[PDB]
Amino acid sequence: DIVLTQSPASLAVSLGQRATISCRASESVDNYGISSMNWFQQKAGQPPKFLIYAASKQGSGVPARFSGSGSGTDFSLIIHPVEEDDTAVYFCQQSKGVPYTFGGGTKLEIKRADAAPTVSIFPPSSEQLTSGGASVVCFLNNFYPKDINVKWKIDGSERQNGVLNSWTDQDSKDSTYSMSSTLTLTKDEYERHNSYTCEATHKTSTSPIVKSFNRNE
Amino acid sequence: EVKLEESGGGLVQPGGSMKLSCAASGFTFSDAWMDWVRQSPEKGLEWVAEIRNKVNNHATNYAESVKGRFTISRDDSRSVVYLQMNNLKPEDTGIYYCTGLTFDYWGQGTTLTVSSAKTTAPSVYPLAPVCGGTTGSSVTLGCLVKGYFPEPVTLTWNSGSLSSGVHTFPALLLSGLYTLSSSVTVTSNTWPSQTITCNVAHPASSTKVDKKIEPRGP
Amino acid sequence: PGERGETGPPGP
């Protein structure tokens, strides 16, 4: 088996700049005078999309800014100029012979100006409470960079168990990230305490963005 | 335009069987070499199996990890490729793509989950803003999908109509069962004036649920 | 190329 090793694992590039992604094969992918090396783009929630073949040749209909180079064991994909929509995972892949093998992928992130999250907090719904559950949900939407911290407080007292955080992949339009934080409790424990708070610490502001409610309003 | 549509994924017990199939149009099918590729978090993209065209004797090839268990075939008269999978194992779990012209064209994928866990439908809860009313000139609603297995579900807002300003978050495992949420943001005139409805489908349990987002009464 | 694909294996 030919093993393809990509580098870097991920990378952050400004709009208009060049991105360079590498792929190294464990042995030569040359055969019949052609370097059998292909590149694919995988956006979020999508199949891979075919970009480059034979190391340097563009796939039918593929944009001008994607180009490739290399032969033998060392190859690279170049993107210039980088665009908002180019945020994705890029895979190299080798068709010299069976078995056909893919690289581990390289994540391209687009750099943009910092942006604070818009924070919304949601008590458990009537339907969830009458079913015997209770989940409190905080949405932190459209921020940059991805690095963020969330802290739950129940009656002014910090809480850690039952919390689950899920980030989106970077947005293809505005280059931001969004996130959901979900505190799940028993209905019994939800109804003991009154004040539920959700604190977002982020690069954009020294003091946190706080959103809160009381169970009786 | 080229179009590939997989079918027949889902849940199955370890040691069990499953037949995926793929319908293709937009290219001369009997000429095309077709493959199956799978994707997992553990192993990334794995080529699984190849079947060549009539000129190459419909030759087949397989990845080492599936030889003896998986069989690829085609019906050139129906423009379909099949993948019969026997004696399935937990590591066979993942998204299975049907590809055409080797890897020039890809289908949307179908999900295969190998587990002795049982199918469980989701609970779907509408999340309306805090009792009090709207902070500002836009407002954010939500929708929580809790307690389902296996993956995936599909969540939309107003049956696909309301698409921008939506953030649907990746599912997570909550002690054997999956939870995900989605937020949508509109201008404060839109809601509650016009009604907004979270639509969740869970093919594995034949579940289709619609939950209208109502403002909270005390 | 309309058979094997642009991404398919090299061949004589």
Number of helices of chain A: 2
End-to-end CA span of chain C: 12 Å
Give the helix proportion of chain A (percent range).
under 10%
The helix content of chain C is under 10%
Note the overall shape of chain A. elongated
Proper CATH architecture of the largest domain in chain A: Sandwich
> Please, what is the oligomeric state?
heterotrimer
How many beta-strand runs of chain A?
21
Compose a concise summary of this entry.
The complex is a heterotrimer of chains A (217), B (218) and C (12). By secondary structure, chain A is mostly beta strands. Chain A is 5% helix and 55% strand.
Summary keywords:
heterotrimer; A: 217 residues; mainly beta; Immunoglobulin-like; seven-stranded mixed sheet; 2 helices; 21 strands; C: 12 residues; little secondary structure; flat
Summarize the structure in words:
The complex is a heterotrimer of chains A (217), B (218) and C (12). Chain A is mainly beta and 217 residues long. Chain A has two domains: 1-112, Immunoglobulins (Immunoglobulin-like), CATH 2.60.40.10; 113-217, Immunoglobulin-like. Chain A is built from two helices and 21 strands. The longest helix of chain A is centred in the last third of the chain and has 6 residues, at 187-192. In chain A, 39% of the residues are buried. Chain B folds into two domains: 1-116, no CATH class; 117-205, Immunoglobulins (Immunoglobulin-like). Chain B is built from no helices and 19 strands. In chain B, a hairpin with a 4-residue loop joins strand 7 and strand 8 (80-85). In chain C, 0% of the residues lie in helices and 0% in strands. Chain C contains no helices and no strands. Classes of the chains: A mainly beta (217), B mainly beta (218), C little secondary structure (12). Chains in contact: A-B, A-C, B-C. The interface between A and B is large, with 45 and 45 residues. The PDB classes it as immune system. Keywords: anti-citrullinated protein antibody (ACPA) Fab fragment collagen type II citrullinated C1 epitope, immune system. It forms a trimeric assembly. The entry is titled "ACC1 Fab fragment in complex with citrullinated CII616-639 epitope of collagen type II (ptm23)".
